[PDB]
Design a protein around this ligand. Structure first.
Ligand SMILES: [Mg+2]
Lengths: 389, 466
RNA sequence: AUACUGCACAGCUGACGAU
DNA sequence: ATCGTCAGCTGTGCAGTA
């Protein structure tokens, strides 16, 4: 089948050639590579001496990277070396069965090897009555990362006390003082950012064994268990100095907001420099039909992981969503909704979150700096795409 | 700021006839495979029920005559398949001879669909298929590559214990590799559900990508010659790449270690051998011992000195787990016993919660490298200025490269060279590959090697694994 | 299992601190 | 043989193929 399409392509390309003269012989079946020999007619007499022509025919179907304006063809270097060592110019044509697209391309014989990657072009490259003699005369954007450089205070506090943490929690909930969440006990040592003796939490610590130590001594070390205890202390501290408009859920380690204003959404406008934080931080959604039944009231929370780099500590932000059906009860089912919202939001929602949180939300003992900024050598050309939501 | 950001370019892939391009699809459609096949015949055998065989023949007949693209939106994402004509991107053709074709009777499928015991039903289906293929192989009607096309009523029992792992483990004694095809790909009319409750059905991508991926896998399995390879630069020393991953036993919790070896051929070729050894387990830990690493390095060096008649100069080892003192000591002892002077040991971590953020509803480009004080954050998935847009939602997670302290090369050169090793695998043809082939090949080898019994044959041929 | 990405859920592993 | 702390690695499955 493909053997006859080449023969009929050669025959009709020759018919186009013989249309205005252009004396073409073709070859025998002994040929390899170059096709037959053709000439150029001059108003009824073969003024042209000789030239070489090669057929290349293909079936119905577009070429490589063909989009309404051009296409591309690649040349084998054996064939290129075959034509480069010759005594006659050669021409290359293409297929004819979609709308008879007889095109001409010529490879030169100038100094320097390499002539492949024939990139064909628009309507000025076709066999027609428009022009026939033209091939017969051969006689960045700076970005940011999601890290937070943390500046430590002056001094922490250490002590020695050997009660179990389960009993200490039960001590601090049944008591009368403030619900301080800055105390981490591990290895029998009481650790805090606030002073234990200047607190109502001194019941679970010895009075005479409270000491004040420098922050920067324990911030850097070679041990990593002390780093884990430091990170747990930082997590307790971040829970402590924010537990007024949120709570804690162990799933995804989320500090989800607590709805006490009787089902009212929260825009939480800040507008730090020009115009920002106009997106709804908390949203309210009702059921499909009945407004007495509430489907889910949703709001987003986060979870911080702390680490170190060259004795400079950092915090991370992984914001998750949280859907509460009716209130403070945990959600019966939230995996499909969380999957759907994560499928919906593009990268700008993460950008909006990192520009609206941990600098302008819950940041108004630990001082939080600006996120680091880096220079990207090549800017992503977002203006060229369709912007498909 | 102490942050140095690099944007590496898309690495080139060397195809046949000294032509290099960044896209495997257009590169194969332009210059063909790197190692040509001397001949024109790839014989295919089909095993399944009657309707699967007829739809397989119809599928081959349809896709041999060109396949249209998905649309004009992002044309490089969906290039049209050119068929097995004179424009074929393989320089060979596939035919299904009638002297070997296994049709599965409905009585046996009815007996398969009636057994309540889960294990032995899948086992007897696998064994029957293996017996049909073995009697196919013993005769004078040997095919180059076999196709197992599965029906719907078998798929409720087989799928709704693995089937691919069992079949590829029990087919390692044959002289040809096999390829599994579901009912949904061959016929666009019917479509199956999955394990959970499903009012709807599964969905697969359009027939342009299916043809490219399936037939590139079929050509590599049939001919045995590699389609493309990483283009080598001029000036660097001889090198040999090793990758290490882990897997499980599917009954216990014990972990094993897998491996894969690569080196450049003396000429125009590549080597993706496996290892005819079943490294055992030493506890459910994602870390291996030191003596087995030494044996791995000696086997690698013996293979290199057998092919090239000389030792190499550089050794690259890629691992999913963090390097330790024992493994480094074993590898270093093996290398200085052999006498190689350039070493590179890199751990790849896929769980790091740090990202590069920017506004504009789109993430950063693929190939973004940030030096995190001696570590490397690499964006092997990201935006692509060849596909038009970034295919996908949310953000692409990055991977962290952590070199050992005995490695000679710096983090930037290692990051660029690992970035050049990603888009090598011949199972796929897209560019969004976030795992380097020393890791992916080891994962494939381990996944096939899960069900292989003791005292069996393990082939170093890679065609029995993908 | 034509393939990959994103997300979700699980199980597992080595140093803590205590019965 | 249990319980918080942190740090990371394999199985199993659903959308969506932008
Ligand atoms: Mg496969």
């Amino acid at each position: 089948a493909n053997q006859i399409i080449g023969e009929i392509g050669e025959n009709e390309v020759r018919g186009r050639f013989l249309t205005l003269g252009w004396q073409f012989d073709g070859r025998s079946r002994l040929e390899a590579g170059i096709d037959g020999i053709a000439e150029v007619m001059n108003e009824g007499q073969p003024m042209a001496r000789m030239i070489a022509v090669q057929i290349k025919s293909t079936k119905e179907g577009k070429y490589t990277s063909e989009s309404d304006t051009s296409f591309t063809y690649l040349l084998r270097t054996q064939d290129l070396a075959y034509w480069r060592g010759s005594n006659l110019p050669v021409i290359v044509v293409f297929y004819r069965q979609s709308d008879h697209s007889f095109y001409w391309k010529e490879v030169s014989r100038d100094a320097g090897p390499g002539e492949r990657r024939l990139n064909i072009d628009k309507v000025a490259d076709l066999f027609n009555a428009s022009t026939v003699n033209k091939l017969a005369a051969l006689t960045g954007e700076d970005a940011l990362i999601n890290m937070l450089p943390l500046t430590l205070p002056n001094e922490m506090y250490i002590a020695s006390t050997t009660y179990e943490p389960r009993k200490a929690i039960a001590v601090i909930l049944n008591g009368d003082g403030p619900k301080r969440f800055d105390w981490v006990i591990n290895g029998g040592t009481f650790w805090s950012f606030h002073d234990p003796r200047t607190s109502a939490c001194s019941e679970i610590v010895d009075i005479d064994q409270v000491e004040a130590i420098n922050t920067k001594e324990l911030a850097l070390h070679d041990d990593i268990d002390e780093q884990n205890r430091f990170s747990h202390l930082l997590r307790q501290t971040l829970r402590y100095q924010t537990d007024s408009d949120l709570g804690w859920d162990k799933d995804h380690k989320a500090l989800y907001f607590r709805a006490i204003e009787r089902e009212v959404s929260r825009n939480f406008a800040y507008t730090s420099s020009k115009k920002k934080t106009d997106a709804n931080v908390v949203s309210v959604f009702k059921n499909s039909k009945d407004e007495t039944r509430v489907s889910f009231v949703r709001h987003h929370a986060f979870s911080p992981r702390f680490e170190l780099m060259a004795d400079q500590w950092y915090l991370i932000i992984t914001p998750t969503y949280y859907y509460t059906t009716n209130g403070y009860a945990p959600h019966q089912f939230a995996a499909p909704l969380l999957a759907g919202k994560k499928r919906l939001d593009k990268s700008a929602a993460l950008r909006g979150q990192v520009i609206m949180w941990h600098r302008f939300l819950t940041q108004s003992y630990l001082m939080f700096g600006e996120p680091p900024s880096i220079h990207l050598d090549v800017r992503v050309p977002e203006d060229g795409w369709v912007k498909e939501k | 700021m102490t942050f140095e950001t690099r944007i590496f370019d898309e690495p080139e892939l060397e195809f046949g006839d000294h032509h290099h391009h960044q896209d495997p699809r257009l590169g194969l459609s332009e210059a063909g495979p790197l190692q040509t096949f001397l001949g024109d015949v790839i014989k295919i055998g089909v095993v399944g029920n009657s309707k699967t065989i007829e739809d397989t023949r119809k599928f081959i007949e349809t896709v041999s005559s060109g396949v249209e693209g998905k649309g004009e939106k992002h044309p490089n994402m969906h290039p049209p398949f050119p068929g097995l004509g004179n424009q074929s991107p393989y320089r060979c053709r596939f035919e299904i001879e009638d002297g070997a074709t296994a049709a599965l009777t409905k009585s046996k499928l009815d007996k398969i669909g009636k057994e309540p015991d889960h294990y032995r039903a899948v086992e007897m289906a696998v064994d029957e298929i293996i017996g049909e293929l073995q009697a196919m192989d013993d005769g004078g009607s040997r095919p180059d590559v076999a196709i197992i096309a599965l029906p719907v009523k078998l798929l409720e029992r087989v799928w709704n214990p693995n089937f691919r792992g069992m079949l590829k483990a029990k087919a390692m004694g044959l002289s040809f590799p096999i390829q599994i095809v579901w009912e949904d790909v061959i016929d666009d009319k019917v479509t199956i559900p999955q394990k959970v409750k499903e009012s709807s059905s599964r969905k697969i991508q359009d027939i342009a990508g299916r043809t490219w991926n399936l037939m590139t896998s079929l050509y590599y399995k049939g001919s045995g010659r590699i389609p493309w390879r990483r283009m080598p630069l001029e000036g660097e020393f001889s090198a040999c790449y090793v990758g290490i991953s882990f897997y499980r036993e599917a009954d216990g919790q014990q972990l094993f270690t897998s491996a894969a070896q690569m080196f450049d051929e003396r000429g125009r070729g590549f080597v993706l051998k496996g290892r005819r050894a079943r490294t055992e387990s030493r506890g459910r830990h994602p870390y291996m011992a030191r003596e087995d690493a030494k044996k791995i390095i000696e086997d690698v060096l013996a293979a290199y000195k057998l092919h090239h008649k000389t030792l190499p100069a550089r050794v690259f080892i890629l691992k999913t787990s963090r390097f330790k003192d024992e493994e480094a000591d074993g590898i270093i002892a093996a290398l200085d016993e052999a006498g190689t002077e350039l070493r590179d040991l890199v751990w790849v971590q896929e769980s790091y919660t740090a990202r590069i953020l920017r506004d504009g509803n789109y993430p950063v480009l693929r190939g973004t490298f940030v030096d995190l004080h001696g570590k490397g954050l690499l964006y092997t998935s990201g935006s692509m200025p060849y596909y038009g847009t970034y295919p996908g939602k949310y953000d692409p997670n990055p991977l962290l490269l952590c070199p050992h302290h005995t490695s000679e090369s710096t983090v930037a050169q290692l990051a660029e060279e690992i970035f050049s090793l990603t888009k090598v695998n011949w199972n796929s043809t897209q560019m969004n590959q976030r795992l380097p082939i020393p890791i992916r090949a080891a994962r494939k080898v381990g996944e096939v090697l899960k069900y292989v019994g003791e005292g069996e044959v393990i082939s170093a041929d890679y065609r029995k694994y993908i």
